[PDB]
Amino acid sequence: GEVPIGDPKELNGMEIAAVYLQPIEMEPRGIDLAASLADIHLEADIHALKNNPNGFPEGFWMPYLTIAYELKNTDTGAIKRGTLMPMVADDGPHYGANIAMEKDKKGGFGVGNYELTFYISNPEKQGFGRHVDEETGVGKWFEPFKVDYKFKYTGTPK
Amino acid sequence: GEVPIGDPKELNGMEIAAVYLQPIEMEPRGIDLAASLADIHLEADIHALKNNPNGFPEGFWMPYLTIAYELKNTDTGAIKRGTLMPMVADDGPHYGANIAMEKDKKGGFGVGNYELTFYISNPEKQGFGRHVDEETGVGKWFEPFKVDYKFKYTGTPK
Numbered sequence A, B: 001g002e003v004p005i006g007d008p009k010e011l012n013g014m015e016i017a018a019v020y021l022q023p024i025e026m027e028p029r030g031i032d033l034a035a036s037l038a039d040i041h042l043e044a045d046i047h048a049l050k051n052n053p054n055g056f057p058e059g060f061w062m063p064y065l066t067i068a069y070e071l072k073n074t075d076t077g078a079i080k081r082g083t084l085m086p087m088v089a090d091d092g093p094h095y096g097a098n099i100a101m102e103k104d105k106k107g108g109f110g111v112g113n114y115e116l117t118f119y120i121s122n123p124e125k126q127g128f129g130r131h132v133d134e135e136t137g138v139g140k141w142f143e144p145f146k147v148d149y150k151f152k153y154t155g156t157p158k
């Protein structure tokens, strides 16, 4: 029951797609918003492309990325921010977070037209190294960037 | 060059193998022992097996693992410990560390018969989440475990 969010982007040797589905229960507790307090679960699917400049195989999950998001309702004008934390599900690893939409007590996060922005920084920010030697070395990481999406939130799918 | 260390184990839905190379110049700087001060680059190749109980596709590198090593020289008795940090090379991500062997003056880490032990803890120790709902949930993480290797160190590869 995954609803697609806009069109996927291909940049910095990665494919960056967005989806959302029913809220999910995550361990460890206390890091994420609880399932009952949320309406959706946002996910960032980031996998390596062909000939990734940082040495990642095609289709491999891009790990240790630092992802912040910004969800804007174009109609009501409401904006919220958070972070997508790394986790694994039955369809493998991803970056995600439970998000309150209708249940957001501030309001203006119900059914409507939206803009989603990711803010991604490379793995070195989290202590992930890379070889730079002649034989096995890879190229420089990307500078912090962002990708914009546009989608229509049709309501909670739970 | 790349010299293999012992047999690769199949434990806890993972293929765990060990190899060592020539000292690798790594970035960012400061994070690892310098290539000029080292004699080998110890490596731990850990990927998911078929039917992984924690949702990881077959072949995928297992991320966010805490790997501590204990390299002991059975002839001389000299022990040293450290941790293998995550990094990427042109053939993909792995856990590695530059190690001083002949260049370590504090012990007898020269050519001879060695024992290598990895002490691996699950991704949840570094704040890696997992879904536990019925629809998209995965199995419980493995408890901390050891894997043992026996090899003969022949010197710096060249």
Ligand SMILES: [Cu+2]
Pocket (backbone or CB within 6 Å): A024, A041, A043, A087, A089, A094, A095, A096, A097, B131
């Ligand atoms: Cu998730």
Ligand SMILES: [Cu+2]
Pocket (backbone or CB within 6 Å): A131, B024, B041, B043, B087, B089, B094, B095, B096, B097
């Ligand atoms: Cu390495």
Ligand SMILES: [Mn+2]
Pocket (backbone or CB within 6 Å): A002, A019, A043, A091, A094
């Ligand atoms: Mn998914």
Ligand SMILES: [Mn+2]
Pocket (backbone or CB within 6 Å): B019, B043, B045, B091, B094
């Ligand atoms: Mn290798």
